[PDB]
With several copies, the nearest count.
Chain A
Protein backbone atom coordinates (compact mmCIF):
# COMPACT_ATOMS: atom_id res chain seq x y z
CA UNK A 1 0.00 0.00 0.00
CA UNK A 2 2.18 2.78 1.38
CA UNK A 3 5.79 2.18 2.37
CA UNK A 4 5.39 3.87 5.74
CA UNK A 5 2.46 1.58 6.48
CA UNK A 6 4.59 -1.55 6.10
CA UNK A 7 7.38 0.00 8.16
CA UNK A 8 4.95 0.84 10.95
CA UNK A 9 3.47 -2.66 10.72
CA UNK A 10 6.89 -4.06 11.51
CA UNK A 11 7.20 -1.54 14.34
CA UNK A 12 3.97 -2.69 15.95
CA UNK A 13 4.88 -6.34 15.50
CA UNK A 14 8.25 -5.84 17.18
CA UNK A 15 6.73 -3.95 20.10
CA UNK A 16 4.04 -6.63 20.44
CA UNK A 17 6.76 -9.26 20.73
CA UNK A 18 8.51 -7.11 23.34
CA UNK A 19 5.30 -6.74 25.34
CA UNK A 20 4.56 -10.47 25.16
CA UNK A 21 8.07 -11.29 26.39
CA UNK A 22 7.78 -8.85 29.29
CA UNK A 23 4.34 -10.13 30.23
CA UNK A 24 5.65 -13.70 30.21
CA UNK A 25 8.44 -12.67 32.58
CA UNK A 26 6.00 -10.80 34.81
CA UNK A 27 3.54 -13.69 35.05
CA UNK A 28 6.23 -16.25 35.87
CA UNK A 29 7.47 -14.38 38.89
CA UNK A 30 7.42 -16.77 41.86
CA UNK A 31 7.78 -19.74 39.51
CA UNK A 32 10.70 -21.96 40.48
CA UNK A 33 13.23 -22.52 37.73
CA UNK A 34 12.03 -19.80 35.38
CA UNK A 35 14.57 -17.62 33.58
CA UNK A 36 13.75 -14.18 32.24
CA UNK A 37 13.85 -13.40 28.52
CA UNK A 38 15.12 -10.33 26.67
CA UNK A 39 13.92 -9.52 23.16
CA UNK A 40 16.70 -8.14 20.97
CA UNK A 41 15.93 -6.41 17.69
CA UNK A 42 17.46 -6.01 14.27
CA UNK A 43 16.64 -3.61 11.47
CA UNK A 44 15.53 -4.89 8.08
CA UNK A 45 16.44 -3.96 4.48
CA UNK A 46 17.38 -0.45 3.41
CA UNK A 47 16.02 0.42 -0.03
CA UNK A 48 18.79 2.25 -1.84
CA UNK A 49 17.74 5.10 -4.12
CA UNK A 50 21.15 6.74 -4.48
CA UNK A 51 24.25 4.77 -3.51
CA UNK A 52 26.39 6.40 -0.79
CA UNK A 53 29.29 6.09 -3.19
CA UNK A 54 28.00 6.72 -6.71
CA UNK A 55 30.00 9.71 -7.88
CA UNK A 56 27.84 12.26 -9.67
CA UNK A 57 30.35 14.46 -11.48
CA UNK A 58 33.98 13.66 -12.16
CA UNK A 59 34.89 15.35 -8.85
CA UNK A 60 31.80 15.27 -6.62
CA UNK A 61 30.85 12.08 -4.85
CA UNK A 62 27.44 12.56 -3.09
CA UNK A 63 28.23 11.54 0.50
CA UNK A 64 25.48 9.92 2.56
CA UNK A 65 23.28 8.65 -0.23
CA UNK A 66 19.51 8.44 0.03
CA UNK A 67 18.22 5.16 1.42
CA UNK A 68 14.90 4.67 3.17
CA UNK A 69 15.10 1.56 5.24
CA UNK A 70 12.39 -0.65 6.67
CA UNK A 71 11.49 -2.95 9.48
CA UNK A 72 12.34 -3.78 13.09
CA UNK A 73 12.69 -7.57 12.80
CA UNK A 74 13.26 -9.04 16.27
CA UNK A 75 16.39 -11.09 15.77
CA UNK A 76 16.21 -13.07 18.99
CA UNK A 77 14.64 -13.63 22.39
CA UNK A 78 17.75 -14.39 24.42
CA UNK A 79 17.17 -16.33 27.62
CA UNK A 80 19.41 -15.31 30.52
CA UNK A 81 20.44 -18.30 32.65
CA UNK A 82 21.46 -16.69 35.91
CA UNK A 83 21.35 -18.34 39.32
CA UNK A 84 18.09 -18.08 41.21
CA UNK A 85 17.70 -17.43 44.91
CA UNK A 86 17.30 -20.51 47.09
CA UNK A 87 14.57 -20.70 49.72
CA UNK A 88 13.78 -23.34 52.38
CA UNK A 89 10.71 -25.17 51.18
CA UNK A 90 11.66 -27.72 53.87
CA UNK A 91 10.39 -30.56 51.69
CA UNK A 92 12.51 -33.67 51.33
CA UNK A 93 11.88 -34.03 47.59
CA UNK A 94 12.76 -30.49 46.46
CA UNK A 95 16.43 -30.03 45.62
CA UNK A 96 17.89 -26.88 44.09
CA UNK A 97 21.02 -26.41 42.00
CA UNK A 98 23.85 -23.95 42.71
CA UNK A 99 25.78 -22.94 39.58
CA UNK A 100 25.94 -24.28 36.04
CA UNK A 101 24.35 -27.60 35.17
CA UNK A 102 20.99 -29.22 34.49
CA UNK A 103 19.08 -32.38 35.32
CA UNK A 104 18.89 -34.98 32.56
CA UNK A 105 15.49 -36.56 31.89
CA UNK A 106 14.25 -39.25 29.50
CA UNK A 107 11.44 -38.36 27.12
CA UNK A 108 9.01 -41.16 26.18
CA UNK A 109 11.01 -41.22 22.93
CA UNK A 110 14.30 -42.17 24.59
CA UNK A 111 15.76 -38.74 23.91
CA UNK A 112 16.91 -36.44 26.68
CA UNK A 113 15.64 -33.11 27.99
CA UNK A 114 17.21 -30.98 30.70
CA UNK A 115 15.61 -29.09 33.54
CA UNK A 116 16.82 -27.02 36.47
CA UNK A 117 13.95 -28.38 38.58
CA UNK A 118 14.70 -30.80 41.39
CA UNK A 119 11.03 -30.81 42.39
CA UNK A 120 11.00 -34.57 41.97
CA UNK A 121 8.25 -37.09 42.58
CA UNK A 122 8.21 -40.86 42.98
CA UNK A 123 5.87 -42.95 40.84
CA UNK A 124 4.24 -46.31 41.59
CA UNK A 125 7.19 -48.13 40.01
CA UNK A 126 9.59 -46.34 42.35
CA UNK A 127 11.41 -44.16 39.83
CA UNK A 128 12.17 -40.52 40.56
CA UNK A 129 10.19 -38.40 38.10
CA UNK A 130 9.83 -34.62 37.90
CA UNK A 131 6.49 -32.98 37.05
CA UNK A 132 5.07 -35.10 34.28
CA UNK A 133 6.26 -38.66 34.72
CA UNK A 134 9.73 -37.57 33.62
CA UNK A 135 11.98 -40.61 34.05
CA UNK A 136 15.41 -39.38 35.14
CA UNK A 137 18.60 -40.40 33.33
CA UNK A 138 20.19 -42.55 34.55
CA UNK A 139 17.26 -44.37 36.14
CA UNK A 140 16.87 -44.34 39.93
CA UNK A 141 14.31 -46.67 41.55
CA UNK A 142 13.18 -45.95 45.09
CA UNK A 143 12.87 -49.13 47.17
CA UNK A 144 9.45 -49.50 48.73
CA UNK A 145 10.86 -50.09 52.23
CA UNK A 146 12.19 -46.52 52.21
CA UNK A 147 11.13 -44.33 55.13
CA UNK A 148 12.93 -41.19 53.93
CA UNK A 149 15.04 -40.13 50.95
CA UNK A 150 18.18 -38.03 51.33
CA UNK A 151 20.16 -36.39 48.53
CA UNK A 152 23.78 -35.41 49.03
CA UNK A 153 25.43 -32.39 47.47
CA UNK A 154 27.68 -34.78 45.52
CA UNK A 155 24.66 -36.40 43.86
CA UNK A 156 24.63 -39.54 46.01
CA UNK A 157 20.99 -40.32 46.82
CA UNK A 158 20.50 -42.94 49.54
CA UNK A 159 17.32 -44.06 51.29
CA UNK A 160 16.61 -45.11 54.86
CA UNK A 161 15.49 -48.70 55.39
CA UNK A 162 13.58 -50.06 58.35
CA UNK A 163 15.91 -51.52 60.97
CA UNK A 164 19.01 -51.07 58.83
CA UNK A 165 21.08 -48.25 60.33
CA UNK A 166 22.85 -47.48 57.06
CA UNK A 167 22.11 -45.13 54.14
CA UNK A 168 22.16 -47.65 51.30
CA UNK A 169 23.18 -45.86 48.11
CA UNK A 170 20.28 -45.97 45.65
CA UNK A 171 21.50 -43.63 42.92
CA UNK A 172 23.96 -41.07 41.60
CA UNK A 173 22.54 -37.83 40.20
CA UNK A 174 24.61 -36.22 37.46
CA UNK A 175 24.50 -32.70 36.03
CA UNK A 176 25.24 -31.54 32.50
CA UNK A 177 26.95 -28.36 31.36
CA UNK A 178 26.73 -26.78 27.92
CA UNK A 179 29.11 -24.24 26.48
CA UNK A 180 26.09 -22.08 25.56
CA UNK A 181 23.18 -22.03 28.00
CA UNK A 182 21.33 -19.59 25.73
CA UNK A 183 21.20 -22.04 22.84
CA UNK A 184 18.82 -24.34 24.71
CA UNK A 185 15.43 -24.70 23.04
CA UNK A 186 12.44 -25.04 25.36
CA UNK A 187 9.79 -27.69 24.80
CA UNK A 188 7.44 -26.56 27.55
CA UNK A 189 7.17 -27.60 31.19
CA UNK A 190 10.34 -25.49 31.44
CA UNK A 191 12.38 -28.42 30.11
CA UNK A 192 14.89 -27.58 27.39
CA UNK A 193 16.41 -29.77 24.69
CA UNK A 194 19.94 -29.59 23.33
CA UNK A 195 20.16 -28.05 19.87
CA UNK A 196 22.90 -27.15 17.44
CA UNK A 197 22.69 -23.65 18.97
CA UNK A 198 23.53 -24.92 22.47
CA UNK A 199 26.43 -27.17 21.52
CA UNK A 200 27.51 -30.57 22.72
CA UNK A 201 26.50 -31.52 26.28
CA UNK A 202 29.14 -32.43 28.85
CA UNK A 203 28.04 -34.70 31.69
CA UNK A 204 29.72 -34.57 35.09
CA UNK A 205 29.14 -35.07 38.78
CA UNK A 206 27.80 -32.09 40.73
CA UNK A 207 30.60 -29.76 41.79
CA UNK A 208 33.26 -30.99 39.41
CA UNK A 209 34.06 -29.62 35.95
CA UNK A 210 32.32 -26.34 36.70
CA UNK A 211 28.94 -27.87 37.47
CA UNK A 212 26.79 -26.75 40.37
CA UNK A 213 25.95 -28.31 43.71
CA UNK A 214 22.76 -29.95 44.95
CA UNK A 215 20.97 -28.43 47.95
CA UNK A 216 18.10 -30.55 49.25
CA UNK A 217 15.10 -28.84 50.82
CA UNK A 218 15.60 -25.65 48.80
CA UNK A 219 13.54 -24.38 45.88
CA UNK A 220 15.27 -22.17 43.34
CA UNK A 221 12.93 -19.26 42.66
CA UNK A 222 12.92 -17.23 39.46
CA UNK A 223 15.65 -14.69 38.73
CA UNK A 224 13.06 -12.06 37.78
CA UNK A 225 13.37 -8.65 39.41
CA UNK A 226 9.89 -7.13 39.43
CA UNK A 227 11.17 -3.55 39.36
CA UNK A 228 13.37 -4.18 36.32
CA UNK A 229 10.52 -5.86 34.46
CA UNK A 230 8.27 -2.91 35.30
CA UNK A 231 10.69 -0.29 34.00
CA UNK A 232 10.99 -2.36 30.83
CA UNK A 233 7.20 -2.50 30.72
CA UNK A 234 6.95 1.29 30.90
CA UNK A 235 9.45 1.82 28.10
CA UNK A 236 7.81 -0.82 25.92
CA UNK A 237 4.35 0.61 26.48
CA UNK A 238 5.57 4.01 25.34
CA UNK A 239 7.10 2.48 22.22
CA UNK A 240 3.94 0.51 21.51
CA UNK A 241 1.77 3.62 21.68
CA UNK A 242 4.16 5.60 19.49
CA UNK A 243 4.13 2.91 16.80
CA UNK A 244 0.35 2.70 16.86
CA UNK A 245 0.20 6.46 16.41
CA UNK A 246 2.52 6.17 13.42
CA UNK A 247 0.16 3.62 11.86
CA UNK A 248 -2.80 5.92 12.49
CA UNK A 249 -1.04 8.92 10.95
CA UNK A 250 -0.27 6.98 7.78
CA UNK A 251 -3.91 5.89 7.69
CA UNK A 252 -5.09 9.50 7.88
CA UNK A 253 -2.71 10.43 5.07
CA UNK A 254 -4.38 7.76 2.95
CA UNK A 255 -7.76 9.14 4.04
CA UNK A 256 -7.23 12.54 2.58
CA UNK A 257 -5.32 11.14 -0.38
CA UNK A 258 -8.36 9.17 -1.49
CA UNK A 259 -10.83 11.94 -0.67
CA UNK A 260 -8.87 13.88 -3.28
Chain B
Protein backbone atom coordinates (compact mmCIF):
# COMPACT_ATOMS: atom_id res chain seq x y z
CA UNK B 1 0.00 0.00 0.00
CA UNK B 2 3.08 2.21 -0.05
CA UNK B 3 2.56 2.72 -3.78
CA UNK B 4 -0.78 4.43 -3.10
CA UNK B 5 0.96 6.62 -0.52
CA UNK B 6 2.92 8.16 -3.37
CA UNK B 7 1.18 7.16 -6.62
CA UNK B 8 -1.94 8.94 -5.38
CA UNK B 9 0.23 11.69 -3.91
CA UNK B 10 1.53 12.29 -7.44
CA UNK B 11 -1.89 12.14 -9.10
CA UNK B 12 -3.45 14.33 -6.44
CA UNK B 13 -0.90 17.08 -7.13
CA UNK B 14 -0.86 16.45 -10.89
CA UNK B 15 -4.63 16.10 -11.39
CA UNK B 16 -4.71 19.79 -10.43
CA UNK B 17 -1.82 21.28 -12.39
CA UNK B 18 -3.33 20.14 -15.68
CA UNK B 19 -6.38 22.31 -14.90
CA UNK B 20 -4.28 25.32 -13.91
CA UNK B 21 -1.46 24.75 -16.45
CA UNK B 22 1.83 25.30 -14.61
CA UNK B 23 2.88 22.51 -16.92
CA UNK B 24 6.37 21.06 -17.02
CA UNK B 25 5.24 17.70 -18.48
CA UNK B 26 8.77 16.47 -17.84
CA UNK B 27 9.15 15.91 -14.09
CA UNK B 28 6.10 13.65 -14.49
**Interface of A with B (CB < 8 Å)?**
19-20, 22-23, 26-27, 29-30, 226, 230, 233-234, 237, 240
Chain A contacts for B25, CB-based, 8 A: 233-234, 237
**A230 to B28 alpha-carbon distance, docked (Å):** 8
The answer on a CB contact under 8 Å between A26 and B8 is no
- Closest-by-CB residue of B relative to A233 is B18
The answer on a CB contact under 8 Å between A23 and B23 is no
Whether A23 touches B4, Cβ cut-off 8 Å, given contacts A234-B25, A237-B25, is no
Known: A237-B23, A237-B25. 10 other contacts (CB 8 A): A19-B18, A19-B19, A23-B15, A23-B18, A26-B11, A27-B11, A226-B7, A233-B28, A237-B18, A240-B21
Shortest CB distance B13–A (Å): 11
Cross-interface CB contact of A26 among B4, B14, B21, B23, cutoff 8 Å: B14
**A228 to B24 alpha-carbon distance, docked (Å):** 18
Question: Inter-chain contact count A-B, CB under 8 Å?
Answer: 30
Shortest CB distance B17–A (Å): 9
How many residues from B make CB contacts under 8 Å with A? 13
Cross-interface CB contact of A29 among B8, B19, B21, cutoff 8 Å: B8
- Closest-by-CB residue of A relative to B26 is A234
Chain A contacts for B23, CB-based, 8 A: 237
Chain A contacts for B4, CB-based, 8 A: 30
- Nearest 5 pairs between A and B by C-beta? A27-B15, A23-B18, A26-B15, A237-B25, A237-B23
Shortest CB distance A21–B (Å): 11
Chain B contacts for A230, CB-based, 8 A: 28
Chain B contacts for A23, CB-based, 8 A: 15, 18-19
- Closest-by-CB residue of B relative to A234 is B25
Chain B contacts for A237, CB-based, 8 A: 18, 23, 25
**A22 to B15 alpha-carbon distance, docked (Å):** 9
**A226 to B28 alpha-carbon distance, docked (Å):** 11
**A228 to B18 alpha-carbon distance, docked (Å):** 15
Whether A226 touches B11, Cβ cut-off 8 Å, given contacts A234-B25, A237-B23, A237-B25, is yes
**A139 to B21 alpha-carbon distance, docked (Å):** 45
Chain A contacts for B8, CB-based, 8 A: 29-30
**A233 to B11 alpha-carbon distance, docked (Å):** 12
